[PDB]
Coordinates of C-alpha atoms and ligand atoms in Angstrom, one line a residue:
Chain A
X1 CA 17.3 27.2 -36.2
X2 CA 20.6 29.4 -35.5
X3 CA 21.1 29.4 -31.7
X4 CA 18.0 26.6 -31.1
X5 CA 20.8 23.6 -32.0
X6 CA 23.3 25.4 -29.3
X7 CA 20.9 26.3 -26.5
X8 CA 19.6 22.6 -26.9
X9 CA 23.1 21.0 -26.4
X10 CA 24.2 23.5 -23.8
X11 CA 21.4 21.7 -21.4
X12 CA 24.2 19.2 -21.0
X13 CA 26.9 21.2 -18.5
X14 CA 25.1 22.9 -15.8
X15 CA 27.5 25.7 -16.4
X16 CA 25.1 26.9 -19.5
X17 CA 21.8 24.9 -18.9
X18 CA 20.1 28.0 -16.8
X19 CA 20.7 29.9 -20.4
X20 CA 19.3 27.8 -22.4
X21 CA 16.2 26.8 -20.3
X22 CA 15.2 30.1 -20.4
X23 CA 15.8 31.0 -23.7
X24 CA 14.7 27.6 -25.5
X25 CA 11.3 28.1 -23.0
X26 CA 10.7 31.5 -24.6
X27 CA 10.9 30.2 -28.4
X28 CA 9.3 27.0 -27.7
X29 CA 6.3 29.0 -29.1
X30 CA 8.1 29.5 -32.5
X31 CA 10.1 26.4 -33.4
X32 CA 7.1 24.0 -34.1
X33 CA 9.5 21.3 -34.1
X34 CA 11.3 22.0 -30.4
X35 CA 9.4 18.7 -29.1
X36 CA 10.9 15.8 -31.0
X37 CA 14.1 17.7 -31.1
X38 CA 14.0 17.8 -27.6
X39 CA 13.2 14.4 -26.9
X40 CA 15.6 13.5 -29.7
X41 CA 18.6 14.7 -27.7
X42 CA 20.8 12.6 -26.2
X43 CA 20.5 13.5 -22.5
X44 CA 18.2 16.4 -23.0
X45 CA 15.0 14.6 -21.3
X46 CA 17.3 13.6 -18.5
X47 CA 18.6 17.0 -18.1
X48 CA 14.9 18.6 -18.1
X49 CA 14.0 15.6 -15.3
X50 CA 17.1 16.4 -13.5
X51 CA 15.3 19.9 -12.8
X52 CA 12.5 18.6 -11.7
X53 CA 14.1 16.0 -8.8
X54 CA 16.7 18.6 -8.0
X55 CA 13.9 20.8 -6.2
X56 CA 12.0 18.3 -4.1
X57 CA 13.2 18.8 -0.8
X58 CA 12.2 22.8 -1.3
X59 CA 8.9 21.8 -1.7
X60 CA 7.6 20.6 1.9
X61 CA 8.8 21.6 4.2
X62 CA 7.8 24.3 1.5
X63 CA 11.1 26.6 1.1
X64 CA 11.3 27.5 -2.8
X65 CA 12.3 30.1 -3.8
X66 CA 11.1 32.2 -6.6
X67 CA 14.1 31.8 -9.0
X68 CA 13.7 28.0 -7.9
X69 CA 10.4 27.7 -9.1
X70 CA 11.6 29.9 -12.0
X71 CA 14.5 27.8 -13.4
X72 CA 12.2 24.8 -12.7
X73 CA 9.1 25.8 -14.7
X74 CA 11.6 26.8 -18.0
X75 CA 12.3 23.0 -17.6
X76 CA 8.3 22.3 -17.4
X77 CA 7.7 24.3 -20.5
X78 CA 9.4 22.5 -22.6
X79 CA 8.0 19.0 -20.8
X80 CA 4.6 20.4 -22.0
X81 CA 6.5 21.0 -25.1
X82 CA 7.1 17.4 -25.6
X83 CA 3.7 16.4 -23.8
X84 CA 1.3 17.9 -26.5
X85 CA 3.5 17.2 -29.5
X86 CA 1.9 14.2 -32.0
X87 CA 5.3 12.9 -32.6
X88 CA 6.4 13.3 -29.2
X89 CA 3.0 12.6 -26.7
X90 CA 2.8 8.9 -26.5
X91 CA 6.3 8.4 -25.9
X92 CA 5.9 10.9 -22.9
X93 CA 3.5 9.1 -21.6
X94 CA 5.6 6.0 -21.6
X95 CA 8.4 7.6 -19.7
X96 CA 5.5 8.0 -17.0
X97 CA 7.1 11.5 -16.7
X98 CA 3.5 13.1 -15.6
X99 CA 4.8 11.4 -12.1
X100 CA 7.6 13.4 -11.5
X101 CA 5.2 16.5 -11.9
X102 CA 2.3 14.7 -8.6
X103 CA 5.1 15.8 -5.5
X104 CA 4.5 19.6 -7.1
X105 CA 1.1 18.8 -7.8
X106 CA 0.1 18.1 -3.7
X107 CA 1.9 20.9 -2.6
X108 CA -0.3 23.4 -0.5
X109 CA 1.8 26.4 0.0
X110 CA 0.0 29.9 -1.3
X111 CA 3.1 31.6 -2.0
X112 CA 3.2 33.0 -5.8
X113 CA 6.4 30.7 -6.1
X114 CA 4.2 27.3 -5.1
X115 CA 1.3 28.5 -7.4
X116 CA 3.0 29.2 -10.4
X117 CA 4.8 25.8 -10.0
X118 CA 1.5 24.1 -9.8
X119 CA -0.2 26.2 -12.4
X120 CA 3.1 25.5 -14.9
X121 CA 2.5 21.8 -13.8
X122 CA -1.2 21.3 -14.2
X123 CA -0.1 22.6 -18.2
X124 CA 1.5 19.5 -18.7
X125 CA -1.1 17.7 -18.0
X126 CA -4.0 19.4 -19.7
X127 CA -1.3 19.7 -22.9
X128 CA -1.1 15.4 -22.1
X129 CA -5.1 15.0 -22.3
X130 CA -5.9 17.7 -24.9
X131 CA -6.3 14.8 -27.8
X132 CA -8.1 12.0 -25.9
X133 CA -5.9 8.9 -25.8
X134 CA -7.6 6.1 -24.1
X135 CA -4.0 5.5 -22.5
X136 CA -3.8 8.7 -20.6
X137 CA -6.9 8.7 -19.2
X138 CA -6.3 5.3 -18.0
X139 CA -3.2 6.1 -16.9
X140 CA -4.2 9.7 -15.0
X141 CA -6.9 7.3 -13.5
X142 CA -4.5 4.4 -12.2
X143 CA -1.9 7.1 -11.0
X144 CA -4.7 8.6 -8.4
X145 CA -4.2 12.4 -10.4
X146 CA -7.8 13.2 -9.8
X147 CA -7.9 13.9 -5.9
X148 CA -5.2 16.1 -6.7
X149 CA -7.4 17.9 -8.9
X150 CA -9.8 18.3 -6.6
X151 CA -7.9 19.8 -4.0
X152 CA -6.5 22.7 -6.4
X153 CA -10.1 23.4 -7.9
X154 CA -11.1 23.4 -4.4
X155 CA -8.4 25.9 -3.0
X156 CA -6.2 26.9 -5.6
X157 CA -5.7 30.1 -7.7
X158 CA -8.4 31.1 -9.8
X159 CA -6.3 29.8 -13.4
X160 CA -5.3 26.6 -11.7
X161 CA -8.7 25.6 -10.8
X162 CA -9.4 26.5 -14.4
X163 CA -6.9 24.1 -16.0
X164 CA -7.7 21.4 -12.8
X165 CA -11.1 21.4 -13.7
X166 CA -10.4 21.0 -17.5
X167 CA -8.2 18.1 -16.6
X168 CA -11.3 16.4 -15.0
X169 CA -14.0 17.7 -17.8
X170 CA -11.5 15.7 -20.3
X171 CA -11.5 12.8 -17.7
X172 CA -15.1 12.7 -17.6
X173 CA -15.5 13.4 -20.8
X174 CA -14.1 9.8 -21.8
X175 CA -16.8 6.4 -21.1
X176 CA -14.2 5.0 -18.7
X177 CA -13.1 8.2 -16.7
X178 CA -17.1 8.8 -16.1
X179 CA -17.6 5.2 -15.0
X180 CA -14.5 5.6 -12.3
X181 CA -15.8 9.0 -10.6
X182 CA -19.4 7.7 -10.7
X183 CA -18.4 4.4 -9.5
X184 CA -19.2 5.2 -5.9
X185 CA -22.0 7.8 -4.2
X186 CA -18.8 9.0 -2.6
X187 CA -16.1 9.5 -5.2
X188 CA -19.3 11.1 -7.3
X189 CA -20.8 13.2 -3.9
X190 CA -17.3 14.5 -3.6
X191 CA -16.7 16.0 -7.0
X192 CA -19.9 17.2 -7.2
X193 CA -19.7 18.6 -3.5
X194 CA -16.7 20.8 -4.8
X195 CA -18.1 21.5 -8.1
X196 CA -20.5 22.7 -5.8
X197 CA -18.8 25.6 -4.1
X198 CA -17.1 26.1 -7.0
X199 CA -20.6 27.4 -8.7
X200 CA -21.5 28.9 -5.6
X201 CA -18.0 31.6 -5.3
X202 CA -18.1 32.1 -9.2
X203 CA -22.2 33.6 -9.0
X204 CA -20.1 36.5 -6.6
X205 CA -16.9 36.0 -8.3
X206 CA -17.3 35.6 -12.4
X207 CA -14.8 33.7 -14.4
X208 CA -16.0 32.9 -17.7
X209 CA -13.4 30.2 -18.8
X210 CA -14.1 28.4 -15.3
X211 CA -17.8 28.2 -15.6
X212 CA -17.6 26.8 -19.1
X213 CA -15.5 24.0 -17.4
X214 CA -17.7 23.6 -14.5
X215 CA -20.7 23.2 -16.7
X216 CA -19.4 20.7 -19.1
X217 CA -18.4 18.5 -15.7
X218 CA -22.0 19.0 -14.7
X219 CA -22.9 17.9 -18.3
X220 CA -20.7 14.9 -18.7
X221 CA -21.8 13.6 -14.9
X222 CA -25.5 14.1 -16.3
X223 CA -24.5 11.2 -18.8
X224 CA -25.1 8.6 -15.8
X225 CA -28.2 7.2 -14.6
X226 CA -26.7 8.0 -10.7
X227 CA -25.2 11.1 -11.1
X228 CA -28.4 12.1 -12.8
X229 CA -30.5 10.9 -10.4
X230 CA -28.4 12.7 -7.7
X231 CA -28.0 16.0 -9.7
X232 CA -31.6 16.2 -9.8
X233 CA -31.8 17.0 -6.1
X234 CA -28.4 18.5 -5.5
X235 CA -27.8 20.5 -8.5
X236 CA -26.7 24.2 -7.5
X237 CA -30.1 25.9 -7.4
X238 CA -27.5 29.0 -9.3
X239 CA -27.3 26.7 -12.6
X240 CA -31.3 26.6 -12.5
X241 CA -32.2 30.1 -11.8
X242 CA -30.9 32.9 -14.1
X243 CA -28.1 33.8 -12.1
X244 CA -26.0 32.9 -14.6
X245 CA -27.6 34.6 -17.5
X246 CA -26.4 37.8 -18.4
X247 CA -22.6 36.2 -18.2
X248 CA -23.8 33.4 -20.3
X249 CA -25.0 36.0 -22.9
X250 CA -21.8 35.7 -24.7
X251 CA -20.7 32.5 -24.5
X252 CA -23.2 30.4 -26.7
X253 CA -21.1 27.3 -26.9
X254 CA -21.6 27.5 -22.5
X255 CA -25.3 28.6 -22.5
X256 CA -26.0 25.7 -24.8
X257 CA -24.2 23.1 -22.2
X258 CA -26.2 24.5 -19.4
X259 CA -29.9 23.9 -21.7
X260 CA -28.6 20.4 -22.5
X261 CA -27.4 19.8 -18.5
X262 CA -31.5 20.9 -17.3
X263 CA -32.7 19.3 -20.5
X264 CA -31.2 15.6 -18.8
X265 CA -32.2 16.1 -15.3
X266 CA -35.8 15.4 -14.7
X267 CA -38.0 13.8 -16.9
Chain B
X1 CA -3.2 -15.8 -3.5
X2 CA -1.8 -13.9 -1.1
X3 CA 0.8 -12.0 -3.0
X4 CA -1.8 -10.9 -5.5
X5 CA -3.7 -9.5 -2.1
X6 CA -0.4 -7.9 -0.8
X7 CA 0.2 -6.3 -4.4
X8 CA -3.4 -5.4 -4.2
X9 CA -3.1 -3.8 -0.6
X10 CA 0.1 -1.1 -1.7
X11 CA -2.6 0.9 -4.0
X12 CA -4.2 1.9 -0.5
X13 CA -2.3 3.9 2.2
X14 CA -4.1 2.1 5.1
X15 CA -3.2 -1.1 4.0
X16 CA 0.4 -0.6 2.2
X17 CA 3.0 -0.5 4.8
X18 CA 1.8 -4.0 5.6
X19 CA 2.0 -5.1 1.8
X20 CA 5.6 -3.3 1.3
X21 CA 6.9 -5.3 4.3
X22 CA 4.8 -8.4 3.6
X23 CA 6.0 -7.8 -0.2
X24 CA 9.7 -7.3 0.7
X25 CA 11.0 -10.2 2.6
X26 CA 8.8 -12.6 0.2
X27 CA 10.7 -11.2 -2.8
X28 CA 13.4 -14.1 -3.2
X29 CA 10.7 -16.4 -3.1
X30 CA 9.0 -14.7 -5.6
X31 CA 10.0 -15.3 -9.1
X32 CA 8.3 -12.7 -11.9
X33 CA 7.0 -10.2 -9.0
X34 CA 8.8 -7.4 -11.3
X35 CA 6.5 -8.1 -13.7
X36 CA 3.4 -8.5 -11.3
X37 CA 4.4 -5.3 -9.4
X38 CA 4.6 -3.4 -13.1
X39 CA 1.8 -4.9 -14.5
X40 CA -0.2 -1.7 -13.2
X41 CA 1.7 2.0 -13.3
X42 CA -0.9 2.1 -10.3
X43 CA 1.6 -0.3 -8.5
X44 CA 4.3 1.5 -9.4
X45 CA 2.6 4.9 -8.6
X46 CA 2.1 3.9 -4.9
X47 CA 5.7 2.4 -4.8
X48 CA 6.7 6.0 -5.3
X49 CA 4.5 7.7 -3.4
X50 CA 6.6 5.9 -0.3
X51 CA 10.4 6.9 -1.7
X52 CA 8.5 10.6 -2.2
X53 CA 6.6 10.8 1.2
X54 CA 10.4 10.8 2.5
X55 CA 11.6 14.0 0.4
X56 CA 10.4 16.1 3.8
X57 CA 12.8 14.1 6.0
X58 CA 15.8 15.9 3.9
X59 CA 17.2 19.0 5.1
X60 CA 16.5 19.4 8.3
X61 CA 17.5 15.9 8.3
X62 CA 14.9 13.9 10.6
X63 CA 14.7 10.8 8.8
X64 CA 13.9 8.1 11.7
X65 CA 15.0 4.5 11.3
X66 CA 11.1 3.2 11.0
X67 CA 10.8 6.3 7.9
X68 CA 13.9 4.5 6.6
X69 CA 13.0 1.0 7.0
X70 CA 9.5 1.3 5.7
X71 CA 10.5 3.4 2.3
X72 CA 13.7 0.9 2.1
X73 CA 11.0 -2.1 1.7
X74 CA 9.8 -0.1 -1.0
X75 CA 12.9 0.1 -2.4
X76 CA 13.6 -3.6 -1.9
X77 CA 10.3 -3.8 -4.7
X78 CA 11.6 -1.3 -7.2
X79 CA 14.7 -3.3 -7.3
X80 CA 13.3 -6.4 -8.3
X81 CA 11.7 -4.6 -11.1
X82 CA 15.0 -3.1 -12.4
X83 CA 16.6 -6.4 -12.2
X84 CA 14.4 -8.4 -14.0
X85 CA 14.8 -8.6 -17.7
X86 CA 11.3 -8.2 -18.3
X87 CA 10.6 -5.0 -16.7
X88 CA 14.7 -3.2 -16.8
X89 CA 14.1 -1.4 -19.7
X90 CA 10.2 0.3 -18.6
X91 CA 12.1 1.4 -15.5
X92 CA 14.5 2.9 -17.3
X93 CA 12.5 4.6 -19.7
X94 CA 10.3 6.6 -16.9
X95 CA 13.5 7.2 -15.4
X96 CA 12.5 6.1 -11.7
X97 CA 16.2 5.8 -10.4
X98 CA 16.3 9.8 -10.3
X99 CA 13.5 9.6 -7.6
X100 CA 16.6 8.1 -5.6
X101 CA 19.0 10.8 -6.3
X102 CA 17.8 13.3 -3.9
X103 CA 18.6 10.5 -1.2
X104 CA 21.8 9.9 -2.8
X105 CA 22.5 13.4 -3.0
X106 CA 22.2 13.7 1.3
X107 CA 25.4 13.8 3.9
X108 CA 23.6 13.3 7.2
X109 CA 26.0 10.3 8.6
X110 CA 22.8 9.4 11.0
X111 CA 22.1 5.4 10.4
X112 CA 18.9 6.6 9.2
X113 CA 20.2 8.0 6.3
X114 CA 23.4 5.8 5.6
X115 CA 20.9 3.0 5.1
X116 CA 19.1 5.1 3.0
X117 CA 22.0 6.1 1.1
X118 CA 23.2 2.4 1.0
X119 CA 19.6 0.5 -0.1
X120 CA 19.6 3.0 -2.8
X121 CA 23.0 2.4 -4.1
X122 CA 21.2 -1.1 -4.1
X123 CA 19.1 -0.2 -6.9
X124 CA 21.4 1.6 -9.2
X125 CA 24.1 -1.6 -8.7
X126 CA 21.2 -4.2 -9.5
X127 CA 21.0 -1.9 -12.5
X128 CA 24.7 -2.2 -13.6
X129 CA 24.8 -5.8 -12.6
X130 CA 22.2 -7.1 -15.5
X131 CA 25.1 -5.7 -18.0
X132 CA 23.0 -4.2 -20.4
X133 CA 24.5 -1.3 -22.6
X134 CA 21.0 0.2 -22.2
X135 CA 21.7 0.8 -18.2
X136 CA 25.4 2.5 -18.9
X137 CA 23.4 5.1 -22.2
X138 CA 20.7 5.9 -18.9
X139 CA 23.3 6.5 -16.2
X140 CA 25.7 8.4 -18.0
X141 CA 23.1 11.2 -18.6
X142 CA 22.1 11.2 -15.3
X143 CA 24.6 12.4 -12.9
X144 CA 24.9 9.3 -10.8
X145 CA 29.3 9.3 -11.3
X146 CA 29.6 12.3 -9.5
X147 CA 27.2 11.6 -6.5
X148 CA 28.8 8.0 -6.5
X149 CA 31.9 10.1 -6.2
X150 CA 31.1 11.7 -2.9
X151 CA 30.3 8.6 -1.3
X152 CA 32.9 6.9 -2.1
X153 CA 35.0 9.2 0.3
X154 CA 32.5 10.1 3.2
X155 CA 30.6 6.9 3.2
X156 CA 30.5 3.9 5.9
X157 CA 32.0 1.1 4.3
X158 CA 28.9 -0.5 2.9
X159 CA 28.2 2.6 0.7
X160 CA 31.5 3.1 0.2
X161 CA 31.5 -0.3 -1.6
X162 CA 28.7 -0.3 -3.3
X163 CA 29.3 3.4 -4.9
X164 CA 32.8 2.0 -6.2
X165 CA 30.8 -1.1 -7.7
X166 CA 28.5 1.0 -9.7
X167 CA 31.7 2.9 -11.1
X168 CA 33.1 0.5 -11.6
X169 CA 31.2 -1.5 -13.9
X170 CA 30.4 1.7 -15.9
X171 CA 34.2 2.0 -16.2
X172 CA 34.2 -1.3 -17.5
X173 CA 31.8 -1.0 -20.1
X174 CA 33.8 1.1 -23.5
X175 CA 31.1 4.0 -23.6
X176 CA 31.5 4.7 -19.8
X177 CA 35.7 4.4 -19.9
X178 CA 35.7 6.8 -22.7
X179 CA 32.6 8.9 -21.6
X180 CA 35.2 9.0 -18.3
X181 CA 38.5 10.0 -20.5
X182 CA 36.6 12.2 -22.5
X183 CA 37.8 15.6 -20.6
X184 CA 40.1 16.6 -17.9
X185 CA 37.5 17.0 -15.5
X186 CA 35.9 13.7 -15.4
X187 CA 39.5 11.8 -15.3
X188 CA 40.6 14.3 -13.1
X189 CA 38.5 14.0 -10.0
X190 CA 37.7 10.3 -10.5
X191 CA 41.4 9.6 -10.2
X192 CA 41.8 12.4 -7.2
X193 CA 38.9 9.9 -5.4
X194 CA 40.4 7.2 -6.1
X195 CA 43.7 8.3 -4.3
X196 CA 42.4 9.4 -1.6
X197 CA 40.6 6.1 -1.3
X198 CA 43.9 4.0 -1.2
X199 CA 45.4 6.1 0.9
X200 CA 42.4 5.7 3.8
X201 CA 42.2 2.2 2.9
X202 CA 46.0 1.7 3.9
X203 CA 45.1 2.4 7.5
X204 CA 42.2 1.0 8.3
X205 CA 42.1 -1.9 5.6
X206 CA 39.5 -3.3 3.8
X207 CA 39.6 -5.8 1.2
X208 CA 36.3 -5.5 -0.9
X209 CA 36.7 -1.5 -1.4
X210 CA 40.2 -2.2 -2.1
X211 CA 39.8 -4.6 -5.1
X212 CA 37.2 -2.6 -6.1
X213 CA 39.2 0.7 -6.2
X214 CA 42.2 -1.6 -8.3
X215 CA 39.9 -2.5 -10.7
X216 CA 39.0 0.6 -11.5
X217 CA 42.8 1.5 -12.2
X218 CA 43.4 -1.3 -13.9
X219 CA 40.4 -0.4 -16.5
X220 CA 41.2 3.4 -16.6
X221 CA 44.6 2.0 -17.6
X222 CA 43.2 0.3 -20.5
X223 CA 42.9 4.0 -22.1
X224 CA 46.0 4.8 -24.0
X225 CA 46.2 8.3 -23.3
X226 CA 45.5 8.2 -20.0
X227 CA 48.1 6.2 -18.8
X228 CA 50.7 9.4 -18.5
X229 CA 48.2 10.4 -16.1
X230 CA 47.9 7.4 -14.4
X231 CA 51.3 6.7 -14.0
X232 CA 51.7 10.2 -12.1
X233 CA 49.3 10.1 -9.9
X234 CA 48.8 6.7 -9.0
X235 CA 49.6 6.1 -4.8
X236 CA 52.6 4.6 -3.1
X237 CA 50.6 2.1 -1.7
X238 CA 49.8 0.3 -4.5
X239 CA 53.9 0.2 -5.6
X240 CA 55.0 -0.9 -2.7
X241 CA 55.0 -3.9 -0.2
X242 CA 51.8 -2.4 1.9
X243 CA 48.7 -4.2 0.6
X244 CA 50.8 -6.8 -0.2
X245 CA 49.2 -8.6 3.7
X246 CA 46.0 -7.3 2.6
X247 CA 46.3 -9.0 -0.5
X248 CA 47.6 -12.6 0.7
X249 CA 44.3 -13.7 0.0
X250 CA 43.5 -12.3 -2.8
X251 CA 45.5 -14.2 -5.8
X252 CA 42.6 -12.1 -8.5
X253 CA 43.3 -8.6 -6.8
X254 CA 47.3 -8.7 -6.9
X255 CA 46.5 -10.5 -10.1
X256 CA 44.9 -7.4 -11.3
X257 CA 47.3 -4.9 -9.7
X258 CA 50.1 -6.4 -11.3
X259 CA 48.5 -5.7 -14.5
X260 CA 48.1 -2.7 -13.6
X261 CA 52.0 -1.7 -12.8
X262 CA 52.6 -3.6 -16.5
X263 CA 50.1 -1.2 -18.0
X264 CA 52.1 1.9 -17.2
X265 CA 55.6 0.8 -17.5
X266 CA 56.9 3.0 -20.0
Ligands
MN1 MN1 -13.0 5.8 -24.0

């Protein structure tokens, strides 16, 4: 608790707030408790937003700087923080903050400072829609977060795919979320075009937490009578064969997925 | 029916710069649009997307006047919802006035971006205007004195205006005049702007900024302490006979400057 109570009211003057980002982002690990304190604060939110704004025009045309993106993703850890807290997550959800996080979100750039900014972003998120509210589906939904998803998983770095597609498993994983992407042979041909390549790059190019993502997408989408009907001719011939097999060796939980995913298609 | 189809059309780039203009001029005929614009975050989401498909525009500055127009007609929108009483306190609470501040935070003097400047002021004074203590807790953690600050020196007149408002009604609430006493610094430059102000304003008059910048020295003189401070620093100008033309008109300003002068009499 010592310097925890100092760091967090030193975010006030930006004289001291670099500091205290950067420590407070290291022991956000520790102090279980950093969330609500956080959120708590008077000002503190505010301050961690003020961050977030302060970088925009760096971002396209896309000039930012490593220590930019570094000073801005301390501020994003301990948003994620606040986003996956019990006490804390509703209310965050409220503030609408996840839209201050959608300009870094579409962002293109390759540069390492660009994809750790996304990567740290898309944490947020997936720390928003690790518990399943009804509300921030519906909200992710309403907000249009999903093509942005798509774009990263289709050309992003190998761990923010990973985290892009988990944000669109837990999407699809939800009655309503599965209705919206199916609701059209186009919104449903156009995830399933990328998760597509995606199967095809990862038979060359293994990534174990990525595939288990992937499959459970496949899964889910298997769950409606369309998507189903669809899969069943344009299911990655890779998820059929063994291709996948010896990687799968180890990951039961995965290998189970893909038996239930064939098990559905067909009849 | 039709503002329902408008509202319905902003959720759709290829039909919302039609809505947003459509939308924009019909919003003094509109009643509760605050609440029918909120009534989806999707609304909301694609009201933003416009004020954030202008952050490119900053630095180099290119911002055209149809780029500023169009996003100011989104603007127009997010104003009604931060005036309404219904919808005030959601806006606050996902803090979408700090989507504004990098726009307040540019100098480019191009029209372009002096409207821009000037339409977002808009927001944040329709803020200050409802009176709620809830607006003056928001803005003080925000930042918004200091870039108000910095217009209120370089600005055109509009802005100028407008920037001295918003200070001024957070001087006028009790939080914001002590959150504005509470250290050197803050009383320090606010009452360095505020000189210079009056002292531009004596050539080249004008009489809105003036009673606006009296105000604000007749509430900073409502602080005790400050008024050793005030009565060193405070201009000429507003001592003597100049003004005093200026001010033939207005019975409220003199009326407010002389309370002023009978604030700091020792
Ligand atoms: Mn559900």
């Amino acid at each position: 608790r010592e310097k925890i109570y100092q760091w967090i009211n030193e975010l006030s003057s930006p004289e001291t707030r670099e500091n205290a980002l950067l420590e407070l982002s290291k022991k956000r690990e520790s102090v279980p408790d950093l969330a609500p304190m956080l959120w708590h604060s008077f000002g503190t939110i505010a301050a961690l937003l003020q961050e977030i704004v302060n970088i925009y025009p760096s971002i396209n045309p896309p000039t930012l700087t490593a220590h930019q993106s570094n000073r801005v993703c301390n501020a994003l850890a301990l948003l994620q923080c606040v986003a996956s807290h019990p006490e804390t997550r509703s209310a965050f959800l409220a503030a609408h903050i996840p839209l201050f996080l959608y300009p870094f979100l579409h962002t293109v750039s390759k540069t390492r400072p660009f994809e750790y900014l996304r990567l740290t972003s898309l944490g947020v998120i997936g720390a928003l829609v690790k518990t399943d509210e009804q509300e921030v589906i519906n909200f992710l939904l309403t907000t249009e977060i999903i093509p942005l998803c798509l774009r990263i998983m289709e050309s992003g770095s190998e761990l923010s795919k990973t985290v892009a597609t988990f944000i669109l498993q837990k999407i699809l994983l939800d009655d309503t979320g599965l209705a919206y992407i199916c609701q059209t042979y186009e919104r449903f041909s156009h995830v399933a075009m990328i998760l597509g390549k995606m199967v095809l790059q990862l038979s060359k190019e293994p990534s174990a937490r990525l595939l288990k993502h992937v499959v459970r997408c496949y899964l889910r989408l298997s769950d409606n009578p369309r998507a189903r009907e669809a899969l069943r001719q344009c299911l990655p011939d890779q998820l059929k064969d063994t291709t996948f097999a010896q990687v799968l060796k180890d990951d039961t939980t995965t290998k189970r997925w893909l038996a239930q995913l064939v098990k559905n298609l067909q009849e």
